[PDB]
């Protein structure tokens, strides 16, 4: 009585969750855009009416691919660069004590060593200023990396400044974007659109603080895979940025040492003037009221009369226990103990100064046996950044006590990438469909 | 009421419209299915996209639906698939929900369209032999 027959429709708007390889788009630098397609001057966003889509930022394969891409770009930017195998020699080091403050004592070593020249049968006695964090005593020292691997000097012309990178789906795939503000990254997004490329995401490498990122448009956003599991990192996104001013004030002198035919090692010559500590400044009132916002949003998950406490990082590597970042070629590791030091009970112009230590021997990603040497930067260096979020870790939390304690976390850059890709997902279009219709062929 | 004609909702703009309404925008989805280590992953992606497009085209063509976007067939609608007579499919549901409802019923239909098309080719062969 129905008299219904199979009918094939091609071009149907249906999609499935898919994993594919996205490609790069962008408008000397590590984040190589010489292999990235030009971005469209007028990108097209298609706002999908009535589409309620399932999103999950914690299983997003875009994050994994982007992590791989960033690591590969870092690796290939270091390949045509000087391998500092000759630098693994015995160093004769003394203390730098000419115009140092009390907090820079023992932090710099004046190390003389024998080095190869362009002629295979000649040696040169040279010297360099090294950081206490980069040398280990055997008055005789060696570079920290020399019992693990040889180090590759970063090519001085290559810039470390992040450039925005757009991620685009290939043919047959679409990037679905969640336009829902107040979205916490997991569950159904009822306001969905389609984009051919993601927005410009800067590969900002940092720990304990997300810098130069995107802000929430409504209020501070708390995002955890499982908020009641204290082994899961909490990602905090600010609605208003916090300005952080980081300086290395030393007037550094770079000298170039010919260690082989066409091979230069860039040593630190001598600091012109006073030697004093690198640091970062954060506005005290801005940070205080931002933490008030974070506390008000954490109470929604951890009780309305609970005590919310911020404390120091527990321990581990210097990368994870400090706000570690990169300020114009130099690698800072700042003690964020004045930031996360407070308790919150339910009921001017000064600033917080975070002392920072510089390093030249860098292990960027959580890898061992693959290290990078940062050449010294000529002159004083100063940068200004926006803190747009936090990576926190909740402490213990048994039912014994009513105080919740949060400590800065980080180390894994996938959480940094997840804070920008939380509202994106990749799907593959399924154009073929079969339906009942009255026609017969 | 009064109208001023058809509009353009974009690449997947009809994904939330009814199946009848979304059946009017098939070409829109159709056209955007085709377009030293990152010259390799890119090339693998392009080869894959071409391969899936060609698999879909071959699957259409071995059903007698070659060159068509809507293709009514000779295979009847076995009601063990779906019991919704028509008013609650084309005017009250979207293609995503329908695919949710028949992803468990797909491959058998594809094989049936295949064998029916081969039957048709042979019957046409016999007809033209007279």
């Amino acid at each position: 009585a129905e008299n219904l027959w199979v009918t094939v429709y091609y071009g149907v708007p249906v999609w499935k969750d898919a994993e594919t390889t996205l490609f790069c788009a962008s408008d000397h630098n590590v984040w190589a855009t010489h292999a990235c397609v030009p971005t469209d001057p007028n990108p097209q966003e298609i706002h999908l009416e009535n589409v309620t889509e399932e999103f999950n930022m914690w299983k997003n394969n875009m994050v994994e691919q982007m992590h791989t891409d960033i690591i590969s770009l870092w690796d290939q930017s270091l390949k045509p660069c000087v391998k500092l195998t000759p630098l693994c020699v015995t160093l004769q080091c003394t203390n730098v004590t000419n115009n140092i403050t009390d907090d820079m004592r023992g932090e710099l070593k004046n190390c003389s060593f024998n080095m190869t020249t362009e002629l295979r049968d000649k040696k040169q006695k040279v010297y360099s200023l090294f950081y206490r964090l980069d040398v280990v005593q055997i008055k005789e020292y060696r570079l920290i990396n020399c019992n693990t691997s040889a180090c590759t000097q970063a090519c001085p012309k290559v810039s470390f400044e992040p450039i925005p990178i757009h991620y685009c789906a290939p043919a047959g795939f679409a990037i679905l974007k969640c336009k829902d503000k107040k979205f916490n990254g997991t569950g159904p997004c009822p306001s969905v659109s389609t984009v051919q490329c993601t927005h410009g995401i800067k590969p900002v490498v940092s720990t304990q603080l997300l810098l130069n990122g995107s802000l929430a448009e409504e209020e501070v956003m708390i995002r955890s895979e499982n908020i009641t599991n204290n082994a899961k990192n909490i990602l905090v996104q600010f609605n208003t940025p916090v300005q952080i001013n980081c300086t290395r004030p030393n007037n550094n002198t770079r000298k170039s040492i010919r260690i082989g035919p066409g091979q230069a090692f860039y040593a630190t010559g001598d600091i012109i003037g006073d030697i004093r500590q690198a640091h970062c400044n954060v506005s005290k009132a801005t940070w205080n009221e931002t933490l008030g916002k974070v506390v008000k949003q954490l109470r929604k998950h951890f009780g309305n009369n609970t005590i919310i406490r911020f404390a120091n990082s527990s321990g581990g590597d210097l990368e994870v226990t400090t706000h570690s970042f990169n300020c114009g070629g130099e690698f800072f590791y700042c003690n964020t103990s004045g930031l996360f030091n407070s308790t919150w009970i339910s009921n001017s112009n000064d600033s917080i100064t975070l002392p920072c230590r510089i390093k030249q021997i860098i292990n960027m990603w959580q890898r061992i046996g693959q290290c990078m040497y940062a050449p010294p930067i000529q002159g004083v260096i100063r940068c200004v950044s926006n803190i747009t979020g936090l990576i926190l870790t909740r402490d213990g939390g048994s039912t014994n006590s009513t105080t919740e304690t949060f400590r800065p976390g980080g180390g894994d850059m996938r959480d940094n990438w997840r804070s920008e890709l939380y509202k994106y997902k990749v799907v593959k279009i399924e154009p073929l469909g079969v339906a009942p219709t009255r026609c017969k062929r | 009421a009064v109208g001023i004609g058809a509009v353009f909702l974009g690449f997947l703009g009809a994904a939330g419209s009814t199946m009848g309404a979304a059946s009017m925008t098939l070409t829109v989805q159709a056209r955007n299915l085709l377009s030293t280590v990152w010259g390799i992953k890119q090339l693998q992606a392009r080869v894959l996209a071409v391969e899936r497009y060609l698999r879909d085209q071959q699957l259409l063509g071995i059903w007698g639906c070659s060159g068509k976007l809507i293709c009514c067939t000779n295979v009847p609608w076995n009601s063990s698939w779906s019991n919704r007579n028509l008013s609650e499919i084309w005017d009250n549901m979207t293609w995503l929900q329908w695919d949710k409802e028949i992803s468990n019923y797909t491959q058998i239909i594809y094989g049936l369209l295949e064998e029916s098309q081969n039957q048709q080719e042979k019957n046409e062969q016999d007809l033209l032999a007279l």
Partner: antibody
Amino acid sequence: QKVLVQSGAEVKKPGASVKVSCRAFGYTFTGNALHWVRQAPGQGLEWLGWINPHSGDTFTSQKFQGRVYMTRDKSINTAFLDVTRLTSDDTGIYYCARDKYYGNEAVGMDVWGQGTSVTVSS
Amino acid sequence: DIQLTQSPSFLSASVGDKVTITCRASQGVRNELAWYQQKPGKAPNLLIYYASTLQSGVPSRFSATGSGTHFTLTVSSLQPEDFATYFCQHMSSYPLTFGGGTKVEIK
């Protein structure tokens, strides 16, 4: 998320021409027919016309025909209303309004612009 | 041009009362009527479309009824943000026209 933003206010002499712009955000520009309406101070609304942003077709209210022109640019998701030969009776607030446009026919103006004051006086 | 006429032109009522506002059309508009709310110095809001369908994001106290030439908009329990101007607008045939308007004010 659907917003229509119009250009700034205009003060013109009689017999001049005015150009009201209207840009769309939060929805596909070519997916809904766009109305133009005007309200005089303390009076009711007067519907001027509407345009199909996809094809470019227009319909003007017959008493405005040959004097007001509707155009759109898709590259910037914008619609332009040109009101020519202005007189003091043209003074009022000009609105661009997205239509719900179900079934390719007028259903209702659900998104409205913030309005553009156009004052005509010697 | 089709004429829409609304009753009252002006009305005073208190919070919690019911208001019924009547729009009459000179010609037939089957269900092609929309009810809009406008407040001082601001663009109107779509309340009703199809003469009986409530716009998404509108409180349920708003309701409309009628087909053809006679339509009534009812707010069952008034609220201090509902005191504003109201328009009825048909779109059956050109030109689309709006009603004269009803201004509801608190007593």
